[PDB]
Structure formats: structure tokens, C-alpha cells
Amino acid sequence: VLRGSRLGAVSYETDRNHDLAPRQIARYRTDNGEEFEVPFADDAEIPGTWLCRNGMEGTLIEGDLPEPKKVKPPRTHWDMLLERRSIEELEELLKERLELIRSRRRG
Amino acid sequence: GAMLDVNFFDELRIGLATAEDIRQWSYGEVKKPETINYRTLKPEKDGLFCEKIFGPTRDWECYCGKYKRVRFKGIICERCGVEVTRAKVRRERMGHIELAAPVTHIWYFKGVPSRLGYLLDLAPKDLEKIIYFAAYVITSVDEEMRHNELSTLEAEMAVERKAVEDQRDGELEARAQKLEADLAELEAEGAKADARRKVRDGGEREMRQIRDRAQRELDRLEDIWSTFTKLAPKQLIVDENLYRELVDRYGEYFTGAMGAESIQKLIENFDIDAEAESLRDVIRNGKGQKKLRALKRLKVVAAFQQSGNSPMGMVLDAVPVIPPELRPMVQLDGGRFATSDLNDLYRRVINRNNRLKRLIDLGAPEIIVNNEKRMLQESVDALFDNGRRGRPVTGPGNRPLKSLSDLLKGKQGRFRQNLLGKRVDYSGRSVIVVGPQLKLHQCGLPKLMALELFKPFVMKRLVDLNHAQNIKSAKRMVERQRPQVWDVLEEVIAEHPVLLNRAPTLHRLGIQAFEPMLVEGKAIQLHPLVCEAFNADFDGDQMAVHLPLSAEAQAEARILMLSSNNILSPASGRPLAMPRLDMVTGLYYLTTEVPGDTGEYQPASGDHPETGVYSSPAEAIMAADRGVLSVRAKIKVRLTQLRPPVEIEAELFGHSGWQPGDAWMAETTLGRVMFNELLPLGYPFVNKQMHKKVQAAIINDLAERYPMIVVAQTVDKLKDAGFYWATRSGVTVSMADVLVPPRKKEILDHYEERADKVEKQFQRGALNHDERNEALVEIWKEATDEVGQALREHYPDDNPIITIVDSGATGNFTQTRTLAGMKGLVTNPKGEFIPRPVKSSFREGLTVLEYFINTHGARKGLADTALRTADSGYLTRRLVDVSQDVIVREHDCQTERGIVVELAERAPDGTLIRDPYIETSAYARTLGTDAVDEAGNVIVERGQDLGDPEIDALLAAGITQVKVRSVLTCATSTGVCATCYGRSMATGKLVDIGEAVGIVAAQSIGEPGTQLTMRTDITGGLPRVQELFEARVPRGKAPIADVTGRVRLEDGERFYKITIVPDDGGEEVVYDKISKRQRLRVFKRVLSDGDHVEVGQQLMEGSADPHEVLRVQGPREVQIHLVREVQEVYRAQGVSIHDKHIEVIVRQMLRRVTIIDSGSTEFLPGSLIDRAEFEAENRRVVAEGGEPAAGRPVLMGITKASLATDSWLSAASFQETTRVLTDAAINCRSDKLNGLKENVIIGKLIPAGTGINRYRNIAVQPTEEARAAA
DNA sequence: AATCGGTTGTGGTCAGCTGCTGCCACCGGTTAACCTCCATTCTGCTGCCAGCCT
DNA sequence: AGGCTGGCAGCAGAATTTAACCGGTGGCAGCAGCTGACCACAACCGATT
């Protein structure tokens, strides 16, 4: 007889409704103007950004945090070009191509 | 509306989800193709099993374990984001995938008819090329700019063509210069006169090919110009280079694209009202292929118009993701994992979507980007419906993956595997044996099965009697089977019914409720009278046992379906709990009378008195205990406690009153007295010999005239006496009982000479091969009949073989003939007879070649029995689905309509020969008009049940026809009324006001499958019934006449052609292509030329089709035709159904009308609508005007009528689930859950039986006297 | 004499971070002779081509 | 001179070949170095009947 478990637990408690811990509600806003409410615990530090139900990050609605900065890509095609060429070599190549298009169109 | 589903539903509505609906159901976007960690086996963030999206895996914990009780309930952890709540929300929360390119839904593109193609007016081949990136489509064009720059662009094209031709002119000059140089360098030097022309021929070839290059380039330029001048939207451009030339030269003035984003721009620029108006103008004015195509288009255009649906929901911008525990990943024993085939399809969608996002932000060329988009489209198609378009995606082992539409369709889908029938708790099964000591309401339940079924009841009772301290030790006592457990189990099993079921359940008496009593051993003991109902013998059969739990379920098992409350068969009313086989041999032996037997009545005088006369049956029993009397010798008894018959009672006793204790003298046998003491006290003395027909007539009379408890006790007494006198009866088989006829050699020699004569005539060449076979088959059929007759004359009347056949117990005489006698002709693997017979009996022993020939027919019979069982099951399923909404809703619709029944046609000599099928036509029916004689006094008045006394009174008064109420003519809006249906055949009284008479009709028709054989090109068995109920044009279709007139039997080239010249002076009716395989119709002699025919006269011989009887003759004459033709199949096998079970089915085929003119109100022509609402939309229109619709009757099949129903949820579970769901969504249909099948699926009380408001809302209280006096 | 609550001498003790100090999984980028295309049956729809009509 | 409609035939759906460096960072995992509260056996008191 095969016996499998989806790896989780089942607890035997009475689901009450009255003596519950206090909660505070934050409100976030994504870059297309949507708004979401998240119930955090009362004794807990509210984060600056939150991944909402659209799958896009939303910033906290209260104007306090100067947090996000640049995390720029160090790898573009210009960076890969620059690590194997020099400025004078690229300038020579550019000027040779300019002279060829002058000789082609104008002459 | 409701979302938690607390069971007050009014409706279930289906529609077409847009992207805002999808990303409003979702709890988060899944954006990684990850499932669980390979090391810790816990879910991965943003993956397919994510807890931040789908809820936590453990009850009331977060993912990082920071919050871990019900004190923190409903908060979200600020670290991992998991809301701490129950773990069963992972069966309820959906997520979504946000696509990087739009995708079409496969259901609205592919499946015939293409709904996207019908809406946009594109062919499916031209739509596949667009949405799978093989062609372009013009989404828009600009007409003002084109019309104002057409002249300037024409000037530009003429300038460029002038430049091309001037280039060819320059080439003409240059090659002319080279040609003149060739002339000067060839003519002035000595060479061959032909070789000086070869170089100029090559030059002329160069000129021809160069001007051909110029001509082809000019033709390409003309093609570009004509393509731009004839540019319109929805116009495909294959030839990528032609499209590139168009966007190069005239890049303004139009736009184009490939794929589902172009399809969605075409749907954005779509005017539904204007398109519907132009389609309605076409269907009003034009005709032909244009009108038929416009009708088929207007179905889906009007569906999108008349609702609130927008057609933009057929292209996908987001894809919903099913919750994780409906596609689980389970860890087996031994650490192995098993997963659910939808994770692979979802992972393909996420992998290709993420790679497409990478390519778009990388800036890749369009070859790579379009290949990625086409792959994304095919992966979403394989998710929704795998293998519908192309090859299916396979897993390991070349096994196709199981997609989302495979979870719903088929015999193993959701609807039929898990919703309409389930596996149940409190449920056992064992193998049945015979229980001849039981009463009819009892079963023997083995104690080891009863202890497991009744386990909570016995645990409760063990705690209550202080045998156990608590439920844990009581459960241990039951598991270890202590000796107190059996003493308790008797107490808890007393008076608690169980339901016993034997599969397949062909009719409703295949589930019956019995009062169990414990037996030792491991087999169920079934009463020997319920085996005909269950269709059970004891060669290894098994039964299932179910336990009813609540008070209502116990009351239903005790009242509605107790076994002694169901004696009569609900199809014909014949008794089913009747004596059979051994109880028939015993009562036939007991009640037969043997002349010359021991201690007979002598009339003697002269020396001594009579000496056969007994003063009581006690004295006769004492004389039979001595060896002085036989139980089958004719005596004269004096009876005092048995009622005399009607003639003797009338003569001897007075105005009334036999009055028990009054003595009369009977002239009978002692075994007949012993039989008549088992019948009720007031039942008159029978004095007949008990064939099975005689016993069935007695039990029918008892069931009509006495209560149900009296009938059940009487059949148990007959069971006992039959079994006793069966073992004292002397029926055995030896080989000396299988007598052989003493003339068999003479008979077979006399017919062997005739067969030899026919064979020598074939050898001389006088007759062909086939006519020789026909002569031989007729010779050996006569020989088989003569051998059987000589055998029947040879056997004595008290042989055991003859007695078992002749008492009606079992068997028939053709088996006796093949056992002793001659097997006869046997068939081929095809089915034709073989012209050499089997001349040996099985008593003699067949030879090697006779045995090998006999096995062909034996195996074909067994295989056909298997196939017939499957086909009868399929027919019963269709009949249940068509007629499940015919339930009794009323007592009297008070209509004055009815049908005329035939009732003993009148002989020319002058008498009333009774109709042979009058028990299935005119009994059990309510009279509709008063039945008078010569307009005199009424005999049977209106509203009477038409039983045996009424039919006898009508035939004595000389009435051949009555008008009875029928369900074909019922006036009730929903369902039928009880007066029109009439008597319930199982109870013998008028039918109740909640009965599911259509389920009863479907099972009454479909249970006598498997005994409906074709014969020994007209269909004749169960294939004949499946084509009358499906309203097909038959195989051997014979024409019927259209109008009264005279005939023209023209014999054409080797086959007929029939023309009817009407008596009204109208045009002639011509039946053209009639093959001569079918013969002409005979009536009273064959149809000859120059004969007069009636309006419904069948001209050839064969099956008339029902669709033409309805057109020519009317809706009444197709009800007479369809009911009679179904019953001819059943009556040929000796099967009794009442006609009211076929008129319940036939009424559901004629529910509708077909529209032949729209009139003024919303009815597209050619569509079939219900007749009740065809007339509710005509009284609304002959008010406020005079412009009704016109409708003609239709006849439908049982498959076509039950898929065109108002409930999408019961039509999707019948068959064609994908087609039903894909236009219930387009029409935005709503389901009011009125039916019998939609209440089973969603789990509430069916609207029939005890589940209707009349019975369900009964208020019970003690009466005032009984309350205060206790 | 007890009896319900404090004080605590003193000895383990027990896990809860806290550094802390490796150390080990995990993920991204790189590599430069040359060699370039995978059963049967019923029903309905859609496309084919001759055949009269203006 | 062309054209758009009639059978007509074909097709689809549904039922019973090959690997390796290198950087760098976050997670793991184990273990003194405090704890800092916990536990406990035993003994010493604060009135109070």
C-alpha cells in the first residue's frame, strides 16, 4: 500500500475569534497607481517596499524613506567593447567610417 | 455572489474571464519555474508552490517560524510575507502568470466551428497562419491619405518603371554594339557558316534572357502596385518579401502584424452592432450559400452582442495558475516523489515567458523573437488542451501529458468519475449464498462484516453498558474482538435496515433494503425470491452492502425500498417475487392429478359403498401418512375452512355468506387442499394444476385485492411448500431418462435421399450454387421439425425432462430437442446457415467435425452477449438524460385531450375478438370521455382507471374504442400530472405527486437489453431500437405516399420508379431512385400499377422514416408510429413494457418547433426552440401588432434533445464537455439548478420524491388529547 | 506546636544570541586552429468543379 | 463574353558530443562567552491560631 505525505502539518486547535494579537495596517502603492493593504503585527517594523499582488514592488505610502539607489548593470555592450578597445582606436575607426560615408555620398 | 459556499445557491453562471478577472482572483504572480528545494524539500519563493502566494504549508505558522500560534491569526510576517492561517487555503488560492506577449485561447480558435473565425470572418486556415506567425494581416489602412496621394504615387511608379525600361534600352544598345562587332569579326574571317550563327544565337539568347529579367522585374513592380491599390483590413500577406517591399515603399497608410496581438487589434477595431445589422440584412434579403453562412455567423455575433460579453476575452494577457494541492507533489514511502503533470505544463509556460522577456530586453532580431512568441503560444495551448493542435507533448516513455481539459472530459473525467458517482464509507461486499430459511424482509449478514460496518454504534454501546471506560478502550475492544462485542452487536443491529446492491443496477429493484440478522461464516444469505429482481444466481456472484445513517435515510429504507413492499415489477406490473424453478416443480407436482393413483375415489356399488370419501383433510392426511392415499389421487373431501368457488358458493349458500365453518363437499385431490391452505382465508378454492402462469395469475389477483403484507406472507408460504414437495418429487437426470426417438434413422434417411437428389441436380448443372444451398436449408429445417415432433410424441408426460420444461419452471423444448434428437443446422462466422446439419444429439455425442462446426456459432453468441450488455447500458444512459425532467407535479391538469386506443376489433362473423396487446395499451389508464353504447347510457364514466372489470364491461356492452388520457397530450407546463400518467404499475394505484416517472421509464425500456437479438438489410434487434429513439433515417428506408391518388409502377432498368397522380388534379409526386433489392409492399397482395393509395401509405417494403410521417401526416401519427415500432422489437422476444413508458420518451422528442420565418422577435430561422416559449413570444407579438413567427414541428433524437437543454451543468456532464462549455461561456449562460442531475452534482436534495416542498416541510406534533394524557 | 506566604545561599543549568571563525553551497562569467537546416459509425464542415444564365 | 450555385468528395470530431578555472557572497554550523533567566534543594523568616 502506497502512503504519501504532502509535507505539511495539521494541528488540533479550537479556532477562536476573540483573544487575538493586535495588528496594524500598512498601505503600499505600485508604479501604476494600485494600492494594497497589508496587516502587519503591532510590534513589528514596517518595511519600505513590499512585493504586492501584481508581482511588482510598491513603495510605502508615507513620505519618510530615502532608501532606493542605483544598482546599475556593469555589463552592457559598451562596457564589453571598452574593455578590449581604446578611445583613440575607436575614434580612428569612427573617423575612417565617416570618411568612407563622405566619399560614398559626397565624394 | 457567494464565495465561501454556504448552501443557499440560486444560480451558477458561466462566462468568459478577462484579464482583470484573472488578476483579481490571483493572490500573487508566480515568476519562477521552481517547485521545492532539492535539499530541504521546502517550497521556493516565487515558485509554483510558493507560500507567500498560496498560503502556508503548516497550520498557523509562517515560513521562517517567527509566528506560530492562533494568537497570531491573520497577520502577515514582515520577513517572509506568509500569512499565518490554515494550511487548507492551499486548495483555494490562485495565482497568475503575466505574459510578455498576448496569446489566444485554444478553445475559441481551433475547435469546429471556429468561433474566432466566425466573429472576424477569417477562414481557419487563414487564421492559423496569422496566430502561428506564418503570414501577416492588415490591421488598419488609411483611406483619406491613400485617396489624396494615389496620383503622386502612380507618378512615382511610372517614373521608376521608365528608368527600368531605359536601363533595358541601354542594354539593347550595348548588346547591339557587341553583336555588330561579332558580325564584323565573323563574316570577314573564314569559318563555318553555321558557327558564325551560333555566337549570334547565343547573343540573341542573351537578349531574350535579359529582356526576360526586365519583364519579370516589371511584373514584380506591377504586383506591388496592385497590392497597394487593393489594400484593405483583414487581408493576408504571405510572401514576406512582398510585405517588406510594401512597408519599404508605402510604410505609411497601413499597419500590419502577426500573431495574437494582431488578432486582438482586429477585435479592438470591430463593430459588433454594425456587423450584426449587416448579417441580418443578408439573412433577410439574400439567399443560398450566403444566407446559410450568414446564419451560422450570426449565432456567435448575436451571442456577443445580446450579452454583456466583449470578444476581447478570447485573447489572453494573463494565465491563471491552479492551487498547489490540486496538483500536488507527494513524497512516497522510501523518499520517492510523485508529481502531477500540470507542473510540467506550467513550467514550460514560465520558462518560455521568461526567455521572451530576456530576448525583448536584449533587442534580438525578429526571427528569434517571433520563434519565441510562437513557442510561447504553443506551450499555453498545450497547457489548456494537449494534442488538439499538433502532436501532444509527451513525458517519459512516450506518454502524453494530462492537460487541463483532460481533467474534465470523458468517462474518467471529473463529471463522470467523481461527481455523478463516488466511493462511500459504511460499505461492505461479500459473496451471496442462498438463505431459504429467511423471510422476505430479511438478509443474513456475516458477523465480521457487521462488526466493521456498525463500529461507532457498538463503541457507543460498550461505553454505555460500562464494558469500557472510554472511547479509546472501547475501540480497542472492537479491534481485538472481545467476547462482549457480539452480545452488544446483536443489540445495535436489531431493526436497522441495510441496502443490498448487485451490479449492474439495471432497474430500480437492483437495490433493496433488508433487515439484517447475524450469521456465522463469511457469506451473505439472500432470500430465494429476490434473485429475479437482483438477477443473481449463486455461481460466484457478489453483493454490496450499504448502511443508512440518519433518521430520514432509515425511514426511506424501511418504507420506500423494503423488499416486501416491492413485489410487482414497475415496467409491466407482473409479479417478480414469485415462485420459480424448484418452487414451481414442487407446486406443480403437488397439484397435478394422476388417474388410477392410490386410494382413489371409486363410485362403486353393488357390494360396498364408494370408499374414496373423507370427512376432513386431517383424516386425509392421516390416510396419506399410512400407505393408503396418494397426494395426487382424486378424492372427495369435506371442507369447512376453505371457501367454495363462485358457482358452488352461489348454488349451496344463500344470498351471501359462505361464513367459515359451513361445510361443503369438494371433489379434488389432497394436494390441492394442501395448496389452498396456503392462500388467504377468504380466497376461493382454486382446483387447478399449478403451471407458472396459473401461479402468476393468482399472485396478481392477490396483489390487486389484498394488502401488501398479506401478499408477502403468502409468497413465503408458497416458497416453503414448493421446496418441500420439490425434493419429494422425483426429478433426476440419468442417461435412461434421455430417451431417443425410435424413428430417427428412418426420418434422416428419408431426408438424406432428398438432399442427395438436390446435390446430384447441382452436379448435372441444372441449378446454381446459391439455390442449391436454399434447397438444402429448407430440407433440413423440415427434418429438424419432424425429429422434434417424433421426440415429443415419444416422451411420456411424467419424464423429468418433459416435466421441468412443461411446468414452466425452466427451459424450452428446443433444448430438449438438441439434447435428445438432433442439433440441426448451425451458422457460419458470418451468420448464414451451413448446408450440412448436425445430425447427432448431445446424448449420442457429436463427431469431431460436427463439434468443430458447432463451436463457430457458440463463440459468436458469447461475444455478442458481451457487446449487447455494453450497448444496452449506453442506451439507458441516453434515455435517462433525455427524460429526467418528467416528474409528476400535479394531480389533474384537467385537459380534454387524449389518445384513442384500439380495444378488440370486430370480426365479420360478428363477435368481439379481444386485442392481443390490451394489457400494455388500455389497462392502467384513465378514461378521458364517457363510454356510451349507441349514444345510450354511460358504462364507464370519465376518470376511471380501466381495470379488468371495466374492460369486461366495455366489451360486454360492445364498445370497441375508448379515449384515454396520455402523457403525450398533457397540459401541465413542467412535468406531468398524475391523472394523465395513470396507475403506477408497481403499486397498482394512482401515481404520487413526486414520482420520477422518466427515470422509471428509461430503466423499464433499457433493462430488457441483452435479450434482444437480431434474428435466427433491415435492422431488427437492439440496433433497431437505438435508431428509432435517435430519429435517424433507417437503413432500409421505404418511401411513403404524399397524397391520395393513383400510382404509376414504372419498371425501369432493373429497378423501380413510382409516380403518384393525385385525385385533386395537382402535380404528380415522383419517387425516383428505388433499387430493386427492396420488394413492394403487400396489403390484404402486392402493389400493382394503376392502384389507389392513401396519404400515409408505405409504397415499398422496409422501414418508413419518422421524419416524413411527421411532415406528411402530423404529430399524432408519428406518436402512433414510434410507439408501435419500438414495441414490435420487444414483443418479438416476449417482453412486456406498458406503452406509458415509451410515451414518456416519445413526448420529449416532440417538445420543439423549428423556425421558418423570424417574424419580428429574436428567433433566427432554422433554430429549434421550445413550443411553450414559441407561443409565449407570439401572444406578446400579436399584441402590439400582427407579426408572429412561424414554426413547424421537429422530431429530435435522444442525444440531440438532451444536449439542447437549459442547464449547462447537466449538458456538460452528459457528453461533449468541451463544446458545451465553450459556448455556454460565449452565451454567458446561467443555470437555475432545477434538474435532477444538477442537484446531485452540487450536493442538495433532488426535486423529486421526498425532496419536494410538499413533503419536506411537514410539521409533526402530538395531538391535543395525547399530549395532555401522558 | 503549625501554616501561608517571602528571602535567598548556593549550585547547576540551559538555551539565546553574539561574535566569530572558518567553510561550504550557489551563482555568474570565461574559455579565440577549424567544422553552419528535423477500428467502426455517425455527423457536420469546408473546399472542388461542372453547368446553366446574362 | 464571364459567373455563382448545385451535387460532390474529402476531412475532422465524438461516442462505444566531450568540461573545466575563478571571483565573490550569503548561508551554515559549531563553539566559547557571556549570560540571563530558569530550576531546585535546602535553609531561614513573618505573622498568626
Ligand SMILES: [Mg+2]
Ligand atoms: Mg452468476
Ligand SMILES: [Zn+2]
Ligand atoms: Zn515569517
Ligand SMILES: [Zn+2]
Ligand atoms: Zn395532464
